């Protein structure tokens, strides 16, 4: 079925919040312009990830009912979703259509960033899989909201209340999949499958930053709170 006016209103509100993030062109112009050392790229990563969380908290707070949740549940949701959201967002940026060759140069750049090789393969494998899905901005925004509002987060004291919140976003996303990709009824399930793929990156996040080819791994205090580091 088609979106109801209320889902259309919800979707638009969600996009407004979502568009408040740093333009992908900005980020890819920085990477593509000049090549940097592993220490320089580590700095860019920490800054990018610092700004990503600040924006994410703003997006999260604007989600319907989020503020009605138990204070401690809200914290466990943010901690539980920050890394996955950053990876889903990195995947969105990676898949933005660039002029010929830039795609290849961005990948090669990132590949040299300083991250250990153990993580490059599962990272690009995910990005190129997400890319294959051909998601609209709306799908990235809703899937992001779905990720944040996961009842299954460790430490959630009332899963039921989080489920009530994620429920209308799941419905909207499903309708978009049937609207935008009706030549693939599996589309919605593939999106949900990729979420399971995202949680595995979250499991090794601290190791992938700790193993970055640099001497000292300095993180902003905000990053020390979100990332289980230092």
């Amino acid at each position: 079925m088609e979106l109801t006016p209320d889902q259309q209103t919800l979707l638009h509100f969600i996009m407004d919040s979502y568009n408040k993030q740093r333009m992908p062109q900005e980020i890819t112009n920085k990477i593509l312009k000049e090549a940097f050392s592993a220490e320089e790229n580590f700095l860019i990563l920490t800054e990018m990830a610092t700004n990503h969380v600040q924006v994410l908290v703003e997006f999260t707070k604007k989600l319907p009912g989020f503020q009605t949740l138990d204070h401690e549940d809200q914290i466990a949701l943010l901690k539980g979703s920050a890394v996955e959201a950053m990876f889903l967002r990195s995947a969105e940026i990676f898949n933005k259509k660039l002029p010929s060759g830039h795609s290849d140069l961005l990948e090669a750049r990132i590949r040299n960033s300083g991250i250990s090789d153990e993580y490059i393969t599962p990272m690009f494998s995910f990005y190129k899989s997400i890319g294959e899905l051909k998601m609209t901005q709306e799908e990235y925004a809703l899937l992001t909201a779905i990720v944040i509002l996961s009842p299954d987060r460790q430490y959630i004291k009332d899963r039921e209340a989080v489920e009530k919140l994620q429920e209308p976003l799941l419905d909207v996303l499903q309708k978009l999949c049937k609207i935008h990709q009706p030549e693939n009824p599996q589309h919605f399930a593939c999106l949900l499958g990729r979420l399971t793929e995202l949680r595995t990156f979250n499991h090794h996040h601290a190791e992938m930053l700790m193993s970055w080819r640099v001497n000292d791994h300095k993180f902003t205090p905000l990053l020390c709170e979100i990332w289980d580091v230092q």
């Binding site: 908290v57 707070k61 204070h71 914290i75 943010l78 901690k79 905000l222 709170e225 979100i226």
Partner: peptide
């Protein structure tokens, strides 16, 4: 206890 996270959550 994550002051900055709690500060970002509560503020506004």
């Amino acid at each position: 206890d994550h002051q900055l996270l709690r500060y970002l959550l509560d503020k506004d």
